[PDB]
Structure formats: structure tokens, C-alpha cells
């Protein structure tokens, strides 16, 4: 087991972040490496041999350690460094696994507060023609990530029956976007009139509700 | 220089699947190769490697479930008896060199092409790509002519065991309806391609 700083670690552009990697069992020699991974992409090695930078890697990255304590430092943090960082170590095969990855630490880029703009989308006639019904709420371009989305159907608070997806942090402005989808059977959808999406977020001095009446 | 994994696909539990890492620009005689994997949303997991000698090494949890071998230009990873836990992206490589990964899905569910529903309309519009299996789908807009303000969300796994996702773009309210907005959905696992036009309703 290699244990790493608990995610997320957020820091502002220009700031510094430090990520720890602690081994329950001492690492072979000084055979430890640091990897970076962005979603959808393969891992890229930043450091090998505990201290040594790989070719092409920004000098912003630095690392140190021995035995059971290792540390990766990112100075002058850029929007580009929003990613998950993994340490990897060697061990004696026949005492434990030869190689192990740490749990991974996610890095967030701190940014000025930015309210979402909210959009509600009713079920398409095309979908209702078929058996089902999805209504979608969109929260576009907001920071930070924490945001409450509550669905109301005729003021009935919906709970457990929606799903949310969130984008990775935008490369330019560090904002998130989020889609929430409420799924009902067509029968249930026909029963009610008022469908509403209520959003609570730091950048909103008061919650925003976006709603529509069925057939209007 | 590089490597590339292939062979990932949907299979039923127990179906002995083999993945392939194809070396290019260097030699297996002087280089070792590792298999790494990642369940969706979770972290990286080391499976094992094969030394230049041909000696294999495995993580304790991987022993029995996985088998690595090497030919002249390729390295295989045989999955002995896959279960649903084995779903994820699998990466081959070493050090600097890692491939784009191949995606393995282990499930009883049938391949299923999606339906594509419009999300009708500064303004927002989109496409709901719903009820498909397995991953992945691709989406673009106006065949790549529209890239700006586009958000294509990660897929979710629904109650039904099928995937859904939404792609969304923000555009000037002036442009509707001078400007055509079409979403390009491709789900290769079922060879289903769809170009859906999106427009205001009433």
C-alpha cells in the first residue's frame, strides 16, 4: 500500500502544491516514479528515480524523498496541471508485489467565483413517442465544482432518480459544466404539469429555478 | 518510440480474452513491458510485467486471473476467467512509453446502438445519446466545424444497465434559425452512425 495526499488539492495559478506519497513498507533502493494522468489520456511520467525529471517535463515539477516518504512539488501552478498524480514504487518480490501505484491525488486549479447559467430541457416529442421521458438541466461554466441541483415535479422534491455528469476542468478558464437528467416513465410524466430545476451555488446570491409547464 | 494496445471489446463473464501490445520503434530484446489498468473513475493498477529474459511477474491479486507472454513484436495479456470487475481501460508500456489504452467491457448485456434525441434551444442546444451499450460513443457538431462552447459530458450508467450521455453547445440566439446545427453521433461497437438536426420547436 502506497498512501497519498487526499484529493482534491486545490491551488491558484502561480501558487505551489505539494503531494505526499507514504509507503507502509520501505521502497526498494530509491526506485520511485511520479506519473500524471488527465481523463481519457494515458499516464505520462514526470519523475523517475525519486528526484530526476523526465525529458520535456516543465521545471515547475520537483520531487524528493527516501525510505517511506516521498513528495512531489508543483511550483508556479498552471491551468495545465489540472490532473491526477500517481506515485509508483518498487519492492522486493517475495516480500510483496514488485510494483505498486499509490491511490492518486487530484489537483484542482483555484479560480475566481463564477456563477453557472442554467438551462432546462423538456423531453423531445420524438422520445415521448417512444415509451420514455428525460428532462435535462444544464449548469454551464461555473466555479467551484460544488453545486446543488434539485428537481421538482409539481413541487414534489425528486430524490435518488436523477443522474449527474460533470466535465473536467476547462483548459482556458478553469470552469466546470454539469448536466443532470431526470428520468420518468411516460405515464408518470403525463401525470404532472410543473417540471423545475433548482440550482444553489456560491456565485448565486439566491437559488435559480428554471422550469416549464408540460405543453406550453 | 511508441506502443499500441488492441483487442479490447465486450465479452461475457468467463470468456478468456487476450489483449495485445504492439511495440514500434524499439526492441523487446532490450526492453521490458508492463500491463496497467484502470476501472472507470478509479485509479491506476499495476497488473504485471515481462522482463527482457521472458520472466513474468504479477501483482498478488492478479495471479491466476492474468497471464503475460511475448512474441517478437508483441506482448499478450491473457485474461483467464473475466468477471464484471475486469471492466476498464488497459494500458501497456514502460517508463515514458504508454499507449492510448484499449477498453475492455465484461458484462451479460447485449451490444445496443443508442437513440439520439434533440435538446432544442446566448442559447443552449444539444443531443441526448441514450440507451447504448457498451462504451464508447463519439460526438461532434457540424462535422467538426463547431468546436467552440461545446460540452460533451462523460457517460453515466443508468438503472437499466445501459449508458446515456448528453452533448451540448452554447450559441448566439441570433444564429437560430439562420444556422444549421447537427450533432454527429458514432457508436462503433454497433456500427451505428447518426446525424441529428437540432432546431427550435415552437
Amino acid at each position: 500500500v502506497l498512501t497519498q495526499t487526499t484529493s482534491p488539492v486545490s491551488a491558484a495559478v502561480g501558487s505551489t502544491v505539494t503531494i505526499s506519497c507514504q509507503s507502509s513498507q520501505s521502497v526498494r533502493t530509491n526506485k520511485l516514479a511520479w506519473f500524471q494522468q488527465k481523463p481519457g489520456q494515458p499516464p505520462k511520467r514526470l519523475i523517475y528515480s525519486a528526484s530526476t525529471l523526465d525529458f520535456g517535463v516543465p521545471s515547475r515539477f520537483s520531487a524528493s524523498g527516501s525510505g517511506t516518504q516521498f513528495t512531489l512539488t508543483i511550483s508556479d501552478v498552471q491551468c495545465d496541471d489540472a490532473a491526477t498524480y500517481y506515485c509508483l514504487g518498487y519492492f522486493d518480490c517475495s516480500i510483496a508485489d514488485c510494483v505498486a501505484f499509490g491511490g492518486g491525488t487530484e489537483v484542482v486549479v483555484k479560480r475566481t467565483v463564477a456563477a453557472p447559467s442554467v438551462f432546462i430541457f423538456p423531453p423531445s416529442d420524438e422520445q415521448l413517442k417512444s415509451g420514455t421521458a428525460s428532462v435535462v438541466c444544464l449548469l454551464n461554466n461555473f466555479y467551484p465544482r460544488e453545486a446543488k441541483v434539485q428537481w421538482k415535479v409539481d413541487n414534489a422534491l425528486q430524490s435518488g432518480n436523477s443522474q449527474e455528469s460533470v466535465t473536467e476542468q476547462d483548459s482556458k478558464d478553469s470552469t466546470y459544466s454539469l448536466s443532470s437528467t431526470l428520468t420518468l416513465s411516460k405515464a408518470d410524466y403525463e401525470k404532472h404539469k410543473v417540471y423545475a430545476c433548482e440550482v444553489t451555488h456560491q456565485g448565486l446570491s439566491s437559488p435559480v429555478t428554471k422550469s416549464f409547464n408540460r405543453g406550453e | 518510440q511508441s506502443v499500441e494496445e488492441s483487442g479490447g471489446r465486450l465479452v461475457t463473464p468467463g470468456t478468456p480474452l487476450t489483449l495485445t501490445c504492439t511495440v514500434s520503434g524499439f526492441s523487446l530484446s532490450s526492453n521490458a513491458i508492463n500491463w496497467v489498468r484502470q476501472a472507470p473513475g478509479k485509479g491506476l493498477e499495476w497488473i504485471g510485467y515481462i522482463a527482457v529474459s521472458g520472466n513474468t511477474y504479477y501483482a498478488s491479486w492478479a495471479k491466476g486471473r492474468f497471464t503475460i507472454s511475448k512474441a517478437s513484436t508483441t506482448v499478450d495479456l491473457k485474461m483467464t476467467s473475466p468477471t464484471a470487475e475486469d471492466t476498464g481501460t488497459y494500458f501497456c508500456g514502460k517508463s515514458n512509453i504508454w499507449g492510448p489504452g484499449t477498453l475492455v467491457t465484461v458484462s451479460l448485456a447485449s451490444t445496443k446502438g443508442p437513440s439520439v434525441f434533440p435538446l432544442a434551444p446566448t442559447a443552449a442546444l444539444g443531443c441526448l445519446v441514450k440507451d447504448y451499450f457498451p462504451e464508447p460513443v463519439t460526438v461532434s457538431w457540424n462535422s467538426g466545424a463547431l468546436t467552440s462552447g461545446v460540452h460533451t459530458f462523460p457517460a453515466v450508467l443508468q438503472s437499466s444497465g445501459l449508458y446515456s450521455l448528453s452533448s451540448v453547445v452554447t450559441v448566439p440566439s441570433s444564429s437560430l434559425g439562420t444556422q444549421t446545427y447537427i450533432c454527429n453521433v458514432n457508436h462503433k461497437p454497433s456500427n451505428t452512425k447518426v446525424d441529428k438536426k437540432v432546431e427550435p420547436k415552437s
Binding site: 523517475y48 509508483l88 514488485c98 | 522482463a51 529474459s53
Partner: peptide, 12 residues
């Protein structure tokens, strides 16, 4: 030749 996964050294 010694066996090494070539992960934490510069294998290149």
C-alpha cells in the same frame, strides 16, 4: 541480464 520492470529508472 537482471529483471526490471523499467518504470522508476530511465529505461529509454
Amino acid at each position: 541480464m537482471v529483471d526490471s520492470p523499467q518504470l522508476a529508472t530511465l529505461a529509454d
